[PDB]
Structures are given as C-alpha cells and as structure tokens.
Design a protein around this ligand. Sequence first.
Ligand SMILES: O=C(Nc1cccc(-c2n[nH]c3ccc(-c4nc[nH]n4)cc23)c1)c1ccco1
Ligand SMILES: O=C(Nc1cccc(-c2n[nH]c3ccc(-c4nc[nH]n4)cc23)c1)c1ccco1
Lengths: 326, 342
Amino acid sequence: SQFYSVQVADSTFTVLKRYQQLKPIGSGIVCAAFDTVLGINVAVKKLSRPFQNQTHAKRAYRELVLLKCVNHKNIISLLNVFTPQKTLEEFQDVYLVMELMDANLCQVIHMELDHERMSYLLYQMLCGIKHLHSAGIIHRDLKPSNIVVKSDCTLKILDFGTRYYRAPEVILGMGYKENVDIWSVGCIMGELVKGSVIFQGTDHIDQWNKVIEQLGTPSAEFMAALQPTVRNYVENRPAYPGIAFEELFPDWIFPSESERDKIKTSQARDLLSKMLVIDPDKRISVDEALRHPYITVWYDPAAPPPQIREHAIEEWKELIYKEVMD
Amino acid sequence: QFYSVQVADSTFTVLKRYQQLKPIGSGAQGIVCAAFDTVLGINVAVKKLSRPFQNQTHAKRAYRELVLLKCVNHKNIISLLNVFTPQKTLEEFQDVYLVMELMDANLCQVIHMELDHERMSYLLYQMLCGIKHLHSAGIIHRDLKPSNIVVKSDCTLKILDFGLARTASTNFMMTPYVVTRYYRAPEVILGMGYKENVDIWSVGCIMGELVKGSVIFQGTDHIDQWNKVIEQLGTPSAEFMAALQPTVRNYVENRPAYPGIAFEELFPDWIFPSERDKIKTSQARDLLSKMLVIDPDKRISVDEALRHPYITVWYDPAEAEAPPPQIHAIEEWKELIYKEVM
Ligand SMILES: O=C(Nc1cccc(-c2n[nH]c3ccc(-c4nc[nH]n4)cc23)c1)c1ccco1
Ligand SMILES: O=C(Nc1cccc(-c2n[nH]c3ccc(-c4nc[nH]n4)cc23)c1)c1ccco1
C-alpha cells in the first residue's frame, strides 16, 4: 500500500492515500478526513508515542483490542487501523480510523434541550455503560469531552477508560464498583440541565469540599467504611446539612413550556437525587437507572457481549504490531 | 326537607338541594341520576340503592359499599360527597341515596375511540394506581370491566365500585349465566382460587379493547368464553389443566388443541397509532403479552405493570401517597347502615 505525508497542526501525519484533506478536530491527535474509497468524512487518530513506557503501551494495546471486538450502537466504531511502517523493527506509529461525529457533549451543554432529547441522550449513555459493564469494563473516566453526538441525537462513548466528575470513593482513595460510573452520569446529567459544572473544585482535595457543601456531610454508616485516618480527615471538615434537590435543581432550569414537562421535571430531579449520592452502597445502579421513569420511555423490548498485565516494552510492541496487521 | 320525582319509571325522593334529576345509569343494586346541587353549584351523581334490605346478601353489600366509599380516599376511586335517607327514624328506614362526583362518561363510551399512545397509557396508569390502592387495603376487585370505570374529558379516570368481597365465591363456566362476561379472569371461569393479579387479566382485556376497538374475548355464552381465550392465546399446559376440578378438567382437556397466535399477529402494527409511536407500540404489545396470560402464576403483577416502560412514564415520584383507609339479621344490618347514613 502507498502513503503520503502532511503536516497538520504541529504534527506530521503519514496516512493511506485514501484519506484526504485532513483537518484537526481535537487533542492522540485527531483529524477529520475525507475517505475516497467510502466517499465519507472520517476521524483519523494518530496515537501519541504509544511505546514510550509501561503505561502508554498497556493503554494503546487495550484501546485497539477493545475497538476491534466491541460492537455496540453507543460505543464509537473503528473503521480501519494502519501503520506506515513495514517491519516490526522500524515500527513507530499507529493510526486509528473511526466514524466521524458532529460534536462532543461539552458543545450540547451550551444548548436548550427539551426533556425528550435530554432523556434520550441519558438513555444512550446508560446503554453504552451497561454494555461496557457486561464485558467487565468499568470506565471511571466518563466526562462530557469523551462522549460524542450526531445532530439526530445519536450518542457514543469515545474511549474505554477530569477532576469534576470523579466519584467520592475515588477522591477518598476507596475501592469502587460498577456504580462509580453512575456518579459521573449524575454529574454530566446535572451539567446538561444546569449549564455549569456541578462540583467545580480547585484541586482534587477541594473536590470533596464542593461535594459536601451541596449534598451534605455523609452518614456515620458511610464513615464506618473508611479507614480511621481517612475518616479523621472527613470528620474534621465543617459539617453541612446539604441542599434540597428542589433547591439545587429548581423548576425554572428545566424545560417548562407545557404541562407534561412538570412530571418529567419531577422524574429528572428524582433520578439526579439517586445518582448524586455520596455513599455507593445507597447509589442507584445502571440497571435501575435504565428502568427509571425518566429513562425507560426509550427502552424497546423487541447485542452480544464482546469476544475478548505486565510486559517488556518490546513485548508490548510486537503485541500492538500484530493487532495492526491482521 | 324532601321532594319526589319520577325518573325513568322509578321514584326518587331527594333533598331539595338536588335538582333537575336526569338518568345516566341503570342496573341492579343502583339507579343513577345526574342532579344539579344548589348548595355546591355543581352537577352531581345521585344513586338510589336498589332495595338494600331484601335479604342478607343485599344488606351486606350495601353496608360494604357505604363503609368503603366513606373510608377510601384516592384520586382514581370515585369520591362520595353525601349520603342521605328520606325516612326520619330507624323504624321508618328503607331507602339509601348516595351522592358522588359526576364524571363525563363511562369507559364503555370512550373505548373504541381513536386514541393516541399518550391517552391510552395514561388511562391504564390510572387504572393500575386505583387497583394497587385497593390491593394495599386488602381489596381485590375480581370483577373489573369497562362499565365500572368512569372518565372525564381531561382523561382523569376513576374506579366506580369495590367489586366482590374477599370471601365471596364465584360460579364457574359450567354454571349458566344470562348476561355478558367478557372480562372475567380464566381462574374465575375455571373454578380456581384467585390472588391479586386476577385484576391484571381485566386490565389486559381493557387495554386490548382500547387498542383494537373490539372486545378481545367475545364469547357467545359462558362456555364459549373459554374457546375464545384458547383460540388466540393457545391451550395452556397439561400441568395447569390437570390441577382443575373434574367437571372443568374433563371439558378443557378434551377441547381441540390450539397453538396460540403470536402477539405481533394478534395486535399488529397497523392497529396502533410518527417514529416515536414505533417504540411505544412495541412496548404496548409487550405489556399485553404479559397481562394476557392464562396461568396466573406466569402473569405479571400490578407492581410490575406499574414499572413497565409503557406505564411508568406517568409516575410522579414527588406526589404524596394516599394514606391507607381506616377500616347479622337484616334488621341488625339496618341499624348498622342507619348509623353510617346518620
Ligand atoms: O467537529 C466535528 N465533529 C466532531 C466533534 C467532536 C468530536 C468528533 C469525533 N468524531 N469521532 C471521533 C473519534 C475520536 C475523537 C477524539 N477526540 C479526542 N480524542 N479522540 C473525536 C471524534 C467529531 C464536526 C463535524 C462536522 C463538522 O465539524
Ligand atoms: O353522562 C354524563 N356523565 C356520566 C356518564 C356516565 C357515568 C357518570 C358518573 N359520574 N359519577 C358517577 C357515579 C356512579 C355512576 C354509576 N353508574 C352505575 N352505577 N354507578 C356513574 C357516575 C357520569 C354526563 C356528564 C355531563 C353530561 O353528560
């Protein structure tokens, strides 16, 4: 096969000749490109020095294996993968070709969405997350910027797993389970409705303060699950009663141009109140969220789980190279 | 003070506040008129109990209706406004008039209309809510049909009565009846016992009729009712049939075998109401397939039907639950009923 090179935004992209007129859409570094075999625009991602250490190679091998095996309507589709190198010995760069979307969620936060659209977006998020959970993948890094949409309101998750969306248990260095991703969904949901970040901490420790001021000091039952030294910190914070959810998310920030909006507003606030819960023992699960009145309107009763670690940098390199070549 | 009026070949004697009586409903146990209430400035429904004191069953049922109507307070159960007797003493005592909120129609009247998914699911949500409130008070209706459900033009729906006492026996399909009983649950028809989801069969029959615009199981007589069930849903399991009373068991097992019709064929796409309607249609059919189940062991519960995608969209988590209600010789009944009236 033949390639050509183009300097794009401080970088040099060397790609198959089928991908033309590259233009940057984010930062792996990502370009939009016209595919002259398919006749469509695609997204071309050049992986950022994939084998510089232990972390990078581990991450990039995972991303590539998962993109190839996972097929769900709410997870980004891989269209092609290539390298401009011809041997394992000179092998340096990996290019991922993915479907091109219209926008990420940061951009939709700035608009005035009705209940139908908000609930449909949230339904899709939870569907994507459920599929990831069923494959043993707990994401932990969900945020507006790694979720993309089409103008017909289709939603896909970009990666397989920033401070503003981290669950209380992550902040306090506890363990976590599936519903760690529900906290993040609650944070994104709140922001879609409010137009601003719910918990905007100046640092990772100030994050806890932002949570406490709004939701209140968590229960003694929750405290019991902390190691004494971590609990000492938590209990030495000023005490907060928490703000009522009717006050946190007042009627006026919700759509209110018809009478049927009134009940959807009660439902949306109720779901928020179950997702934004400090104690993961008491926080809603993905399956229950999917059955919530606000969400379940989108469920159709009429997808197979995917057919799915420490190494030397050279051992990782041959693993990645094998994945690119088949 | 009272005055008398001849209404649809019956004589009503009512308080003078109740004026311009016009009949709206007939039948045994009660004759019903709309009346303008000059104290309240609204039209109401006046029901005269159809001879409450003829025997012990009549007096029992009349007492039960009155007690329950008084104690129950739920937005989907008919509200009682007043109760009175034209007689002045316990010795005189004879007639009972019940005054209730006036609605716009019986569900018989609005069933078969061209209704969208939004109105249909809303009516069904309301029915389920009333039923659940009854169940939580220990009341299982067992005889729900469109004629005991009433509606307003805004789609508000209420249940009109409390059906059969918990300890009442029913007659199975082999024992004749004159009237139509299109909504009777298979377990009642077959002589079985009943549990709470007896009422779910009725809702399924009502849901199907709202969608199709025709009675789902329209038997020519009491026995043909069962043939209409099996022709569409299919013969139930050997195990289920084997557990029936001999009279029933022998008939039912020697019936021709039917495979049943797929719910996509029974309730096809074109009978349902955009692209938003497509998922709702699919959800509606799914609920129907779970309600219209012969064997009560395999039939959906009221709680589960309320959480269904088709239904739960009308659930408001913020609104307060309605608190649960605070619950003989024919001449002892009279004194019991008189005290309730006064
Ligand atoms: O900006 C446009 N689209 C847009 C906007 C935001 C994301 C994507 C996007 N689609 N597919 C992807 C795969 C990966 C990434 C990725 N971003 C960081 N890292 N990776 C991003 C995408 C696309 C646009 C479309 C038409 C006219 O302008
Ligand atoms: O026909 C009208 N309304 C209507 C129609 C059918 C039922 C009711 C009804 N409202 N309240 C009730 C209480 C009991 C009964 C009852 N029927 C048997 N037994 N009991 C019935 C009702 C009302 C109407 C309203 C305005 C103009 O026409």
